[PDB]
Design a binder for this molecule. Structure first.
Ligand code: SF4
Ligand code: F3S
Length: 77
């Protein structure tokens, strides 16, 4: 799955929402999040975010690893 990290907070641009083929990006309050069980890993959302907040799970920066679980918790997992 792909993960929305720190940069989204305080921005919530939402350009990512319009390019996701499965509509699995949801409002999580302080940031949007990607539902892990729905995401098909097509990667379309990556170039769409103006603040580079989205990363494939395997490539999430070491400093932002906590966002993997955050997206999971927001998804209710
Ligand atoms: S990787 Fe594809 S399916 Fe997953 S959130 Fe991004 S646009 Fe949607
Ligand atoms: S700011 Fe957040 S709402 Fe989408 S376009 Fe970037 S991950």
């Amino acid at each position: 799955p792909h993960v929305i990290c720190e940069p989204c907070i305080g921005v919530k641009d939402q350009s990512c929402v319009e390019v996701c083929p499965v509509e699995c990006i949801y409002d999580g309050g302080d940031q949007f999040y990607i539902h892990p069980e729905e995401c098909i890993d097509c990667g379309a959302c990556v170039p769409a975010c103006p603040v580079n907040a989205i990363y494939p799970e395997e490539d999430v920066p070491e400093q932002w690893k906590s966002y993997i679980e955050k997206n999971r918790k927001l998804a209710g997992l």
